[PDB]
Paper text:
In higher eukaryotes, a single DOT1 histone H3 lysine 79 (H3K79) methyltransferase processively produces H3K79me2/me3 through histone H2B mono-ubiquitin interaction, while the kinetoplastid Trypanosoma brucei di-methyltransferase DOT1A and tri-methyltransferase DOT1B efficiently methylate the homologous H3K76 without H2B mono-ubiquitination. DOT1 enzymes are highly conserved across metazoans and fungi, but not in the early-branched eukaryotic class of kinetoplastids including Trypanosoma brucei subsp., Trypanosoma cruzi, and Leishmania spp. In kinetoplastids, three DOT1-like methyltransferases have been identified, two of which (T. brucei DOT1A and DOT1B) have demonstrated methyltransferase activity toward H3K76 (corresponding to H3K79 in human and yeast) in vivo and in vitro. Both DOT1A and DOT1B represent minimal enzymes with less than 300 residues, comprised of a significantly diverged N-terminal domain (magenta in Fig. 1a, b) and a conserved C-terminal methyltransferase core domain (dark blue) that contains canonical and non-canonical methyltransferase motifs. Based on structural and biochemical analyses of DOT1A, we identify key residues in the methyltransferase motifs VI and X for efficient ubiquitin-independent H3K76 methylation in kinetoplastids. Substitution of a basic to an acidic residue within motif VI (Gx6K) is essential to stabilize the DOT1A enzyme-substrate complex, while substitution of the motif X sequence VYGE by CAKS renders a rigid active-site loop flexible, implying a distinct mechanism of substrate recognition.
To investigate the implications of these differences on the structural level, we determined the X-ray crystal structure of DOT1A and compared it to human and yeast active-form DOT1-nucleosome complexes. Δ42-DOT1A crystallized in complex with the methyl donor product AdoHcy in two different crystal forms (space groups C2221 and P212121), and their structures were determined at 2.1 and 1.9 Å resolution, respectively. The asymmetric units of the C2221 and P212121 space groups contain one and two DOT1A enzymes referred to as Molecules I to III, respectively. The methyltransferase motifs I, II, and III are highly conserved among DOT1 enzymes including DOT1A and DOT1B, and electron density of AdoHcy in the crystal structures of DOT1A are clearly observed in all three molecules. Specifically, AdoHcy is recognized by DOT1A Asp134 (motif I), the Gly136 main chain (motif I), Glu158 (motif II), Met196 (motif III), and Phe222 (adjacent to motif IV). In DOT1A molecules I and II of the two crystal forms, the CAKS sequence-containing loop FH lacks electron density and is disordered, implying flexibility. In DOT1A molecule III, this loop is ordered (colored in purple), which is likely due to stabilization by a symmetry-related molecule in the crystal.
Author numbering: 45 to 295
Write the structure that this text describes.
């Protein structure tokens, strides 16, 4: 039900419904969803936790931990075709909210990497509270959620990472406020992940809006199928309006 073409000229976009679906959601294509349930459960979890997310750090803009909201995640699970056989990596996982929802909706193994020691601790403690609640509410056992406290560059420096997954790999990179050197580093490293891997980014790893891009970087076009999207209105914490993001699929 997505509008547009997925090109720079006509990115894929999904207007909000005027009226809610059966589950109260204005965002999802499906008539039923879990977005409000996750909205409410996450808020109760973080409210009960004694340790709180550090959303911003004055002086270190790259540490900003504002969230992709549950409505964004429900759409992302569909757009990136996340299955139970996939492994989902949130590079910069913040409070872990994305991991918790992807695990619940897909059954995929979920790995978060976070440089903030405090927010990594928030994420780990929140998973211990929310997992039983998800499991009791749904009657299903949850997949594994592992939180790594590290600069992601130290983890990704291992060329063997991702390789055993045979492309059953989904990577989220919420890098709007990452330093350009980090996004550039990631763009080099992701050229070498296996075929089938799907990568979502906001500051584009492989800029492709200009006609000359395929002449400037033909390798990028040989290695990736590129699709442009607009995030839905009111689907990201830091902005009520829409904006661009990109999914790169390794050919
Ligand atoms: N080099 C690095 N290694 C690991 N995490 C990093 C990092 N540089 C920035 N980050 C983290 O990346 C996060 C981006 S905010 C994204 C939060 C979550 N993934 C969501 O989308 O809702 C921040 O928490 C910040 O601390
Ligand atoms: Ca490789
Ligand atoms: Zn929904």
């Amino acid at each position: 039900g997505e509008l547009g073409a997925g090109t720079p000229h006509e990115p894929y976009n999904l207007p909000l419904r005027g009226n809610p679906n059966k589950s109260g959601c204005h965002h999802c294509l499906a008539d039923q969803c879990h977005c409000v349930f996750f909205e409410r459960l996450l808020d109760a979890t973080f409210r009960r936790l004694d340790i709180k997310r550090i959303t911003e750090v004055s002086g270190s803009r790259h540490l900003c931990a504002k969230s992709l909201l549950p409505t964004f995640v429900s759409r992302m699970v569909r757009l990136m075709e996340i299955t139970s056989e996939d492994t989902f990596y949130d590079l910069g996982c913040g409070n872990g909210s994305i991991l918790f929802q992807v695990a619940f909706l897909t059954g995929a193994r979920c790995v978060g990497i976070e440089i903030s020691e405090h927010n990594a601790k928030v994420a780990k403690k929140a998973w211990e509270v929310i997992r039983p609640e998800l499991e009791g509410s749904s009657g299903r056992s949850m997949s594994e959620v592992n939180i790594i406290t590290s600069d992601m560059t130290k983890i990704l420096a291992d060329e063997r990472l991702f390789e055993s997954e045979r492309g059953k790999t989904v990577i989220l990179l919420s890098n709007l406020l990452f330093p350009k050197s980090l996004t550039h580093y990631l763009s080099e490293r992701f050229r070498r992940v296996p075929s089938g891997t799907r990568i979502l980014c906001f500051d584009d790893l492989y800029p492709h809006s200009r006609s000359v891009a395929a002449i400037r970087d033909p390798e990028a076009f040989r290695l990736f199928a590129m699709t442009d999207y607009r995030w839905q209105e009111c689907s990201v914490e830091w902005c009520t309006r829409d904006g661009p993001f990109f999914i790169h699929r390794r050919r």
